[PDB]
Amino acid sequence: MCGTEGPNFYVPFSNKTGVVRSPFEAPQYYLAEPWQFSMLAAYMFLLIMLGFPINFLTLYVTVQHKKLRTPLNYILLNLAVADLFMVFGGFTTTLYTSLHGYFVFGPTGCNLEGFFATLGGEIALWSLVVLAIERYVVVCKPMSNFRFGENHAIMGVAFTWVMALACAAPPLVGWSRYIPEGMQCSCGIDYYTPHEETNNESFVIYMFVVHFIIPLIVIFFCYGQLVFTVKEAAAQQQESATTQKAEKEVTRMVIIMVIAFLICWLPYAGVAFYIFTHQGSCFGPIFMTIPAFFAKTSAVYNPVIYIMMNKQFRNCMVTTLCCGKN
Numbered sequence: 312m313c314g315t316e317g318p319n320f321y322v323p324f325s326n327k328t329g330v331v332r333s334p335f336e337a338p339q340y341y342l343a344e345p346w347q348f349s350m351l352a353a354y355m356f357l358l359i360m361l362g363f364p365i366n367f368l369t370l371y372v373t374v375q376h377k378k379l380r381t382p383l384n385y386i387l388l389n390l391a392v393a394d395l396f397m398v399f400g401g402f403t404t405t406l407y408t409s410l411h412g413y414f415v416f417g418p419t420g421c422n423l424e425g426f427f428a429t430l431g432g433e434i435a436l437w438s439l440v441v442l443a444i445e446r447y448v449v450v451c452k453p454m455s456n457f458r459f460g461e462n463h464a465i466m467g468v469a470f471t472w473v474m475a476l477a478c479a480a481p482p483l484v485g486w487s488r489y490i491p492e493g494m495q496c497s498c499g500i501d502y503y504t505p506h507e508e509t510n511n512e513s514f515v516i517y518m519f520v521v522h523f524i525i526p527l528i529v530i531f532f533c534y535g536q537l538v539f540t541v542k543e544a545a546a547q548q549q550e551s552a553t554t555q556k557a558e559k560e561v562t563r564m565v566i567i568m569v570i571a572f573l574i575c576w577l578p579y580a581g582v583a584f585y586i587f588t589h590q591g592s593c594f595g596p597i598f599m600t601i602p603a604f605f606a607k608t609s610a611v612y613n614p615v616i617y618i619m620m621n622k623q624f625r626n627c628m629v630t631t632l633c634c635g636k637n
């Protein structure tokens with residue numbers, strides 16, 4: 312008797328005292344104090360205030376600078392848009408519901424907010440995967456006579472939308488479901504109840520394999536091969552101080568990206584390990600929901616790492632912010 316079941320929701324709190332209410336109808340102040348809901352709002356506010364400008368500005372300087380509109384950069388614009396889906400589909404709604412202490416948009420808004428917030432995070436995830444694949448193809452040259460062009464980059468972007476719909480759409484049509492999660496102010500995939508009617512167990516496994524294990528393998532293989540190729544070529548040109556510098560910075564960037572991906576990936580894996588083993592006990596509004604709580608900041612640090620640390624983007628944004636000069 313861990314929580315309180317109901318149609319379209321699972322409140323992680325026991326109703327033996329009779330105080331539990333539907334997360335669509337009344338505040339959930341038995342899960343957390345009102346000030347903790349306010350701090351949830353403050354965190355959404357921080358994410359909006361940092362996440363909208365960085366991601367919008369990425370779209371804005373691309374319009375003003377012709378050099379940024381290369382095919383290899385299409386996937387980065389895709390990343391900016393996906394983060395905007397997280398900011399408006401997810402962070403903005405949650406700021407508003409947070410301050411009511413419950414999900415005031417009803418089960419319909421739950422499917423909407425859950426879809427768009429999940430879509431945004433999924434497009435982002437597969438953008439990092441596709442970018443790693445593209446860089447691997449361009450550097451390691453695994454195809455004899457291949458040249459990465461505009462059409463290939465469009466396939467890459469379309470591929471992320473297909474993968475993102477593959478995760479976000481089934482819960483609308485019967486495989487798993489969207490329900491309020493954690494403090495019940497935002498909606499997501501249901502990893503919290505085994506709903507035999509929506510086959511939740513098979514979807515969690517599909518999510519864990521296809522959208523969690525595979526992305527890590529692809530990112531590690533592609534970037535490992537790339538660093539191997541770059542270090543090999545530099546070894547044959549040790550007379551060039553610049554080639555060695557380029558090799559060092561490529562390696563240091565790949566480390567940063569992989570470390571950043573792990574910082575978002577490992578908390579989910581640690582929670583899994585605490586579900587596999589330690590399966591008995593319940594889990595409060597801090598389920599899990601802790602990996603979700605911190606993965607949200609990827610809408611801020613991913614554009615910082617993949618765009619603001621890009622050599623050309625930075626100069627173009629300085630020029631744009633500096634009213635044309637500098």
Ligand SMILES: *[C@@H]1O[C@H](CO)[C@@H](O[C@@H]2O[C@H](CO)[C@@H](O[C@@H]3O[C@H](CO[C@H]4O[C@H](CO)[C@@H](O)[C@H](O)[C@@H]4O)[C@@H](O)[C@H](O[C@H]4O[C@H](CO)[C@@H](O)[C@H](O)[C@@H]4O)[C@@H]3O)[C@H](O)[C@H]2NC(C)=O)[C@H](O)[C@H]1NC(C)=O
Pocket residue numbers: 315316317326328329330331332333
């Ligand atoms: C967690 O657990 C709590 C406690 O069990 C649940 O809250 C109860 O929910 C039930 C509904 O299933 C509520 O029952 C309904 O109460 C209505 C109001 O009752 C108060 O007001 C009347 C005056 O109208 C007073 O006389 C009375 O003493 C109460 O204080 C009634 O209108 C309802 O009556 C109708 O339905 C019943 C059958 O359920 C019929 O017998 C009646 O004839 C009539 O048709 C009904 O009694 C109950 O009040 C809630 N209790 C509390 C403390 O809130 C939560 O639902 C549960 N949480 C979740 C998420 O499931």
Ligand SMILES: CC(C)[C@H](C(=O)N1CCC2(CC1)Oc1ccc(CCC(=O)O)cc1O2)c1ccc(Cl)cc1
Pocket residue numbers: 429432433436478502503515518519522523575576579580582583586606
């Ligand atoms: C982009 C989002 C939509 C996507 C996402 O939301 N999830 C990814 C898969 C996830 C959590 C949900 O991880 C799990 C670990 C263990 C179990 C079984 C144990 C159980 O949770 O019951 C289920 C799991 O589902 C995600 C993917 C990649 C990363 Cl890096 C971050 C998030």
Ligand SMILES: CCCCCCCCO[C@@H]1O[C@H](CO)[C@@H](O)[C@H](O)[C@H]1O
Pocket residue numbers: 344
């Ligand atoms: C830098 C670390 C910040 C930790 C903030 C902890 C704040 C705890 O603050 C306490 O929380 C209680 C919760 O019921 C309130 O009832 C108390 O009034 C409040 O003092």
Ligand SMILES: CCCCCCCCO[C@@H]1O[C@H](CO)[C@@H](O)[C@H](O)[C@H]1O
Pocket residue numbers: 338406407410411412
């Ligand atoms: C930009 C953010 C806008 C936040 C608007 C929050 C409006 C909260 O609205 C409040 O919700 C309570 C329920 O918890 C009601 O009891 C109050 O009557 C109501 O004022």
Ligand SMILES: CCCCCCCCO[C@@H]1O[C@H](CO)[C@@H](O)[C@H](O)[C@H]1O
Pocket residue numbers: 401425428429431432433435436439492498499500571572575576602603606607609
């Ligand atoms: C390094 C990979 C970056 C992608 C980060 C995506 C973070 C998505 O985070 C997910 O968002 C969903 C909707 O808010 C929630 O329902 C999930 O519980 C949460 O883990």
Ligand SMILES: CCCCCCCCO[C@@H]1O[C@H](CO)[C@@H](O)[C@H](O)[C@H]1O
Pocket residue numbers: 530531532534535538562565566569
């Ligand atoms: C996802 C794949 C990430 C690969 C990161 C490889 C980091 C290697 O690190 C490098 O190792 C060399 C020795 O082999 C040292 O000589 C270099 O100084 C060091 O930068």
Ligand SMILES: CCCCCCCCO[C@@H]1O[C@H](CO)[C@@H](O)[C@H](O)[C@H]1O
Pocket residue numbers: 351405491492493494495496497498596597598599600601603604605
């Ligand atoms: C150090 C702080 C850890 C907080 C762990 C998360 C506890 C609440 O869980 C949160 O509920 C919110 C409202 O539904 C969701 O938007 C978040 O994704 C979820 O993390």
Ligand SMILES: *C(=O)CCCCCCCCCCCCCCC
Pocket residue numbers: 629630632633634637
């Ligand atoms: C060129 O690069 C500089 C042009 C003029 C911009 C200088 C002002 C930047 C201030 C940004 C910081 C605002 C912080 C607001 C805190 C809420």
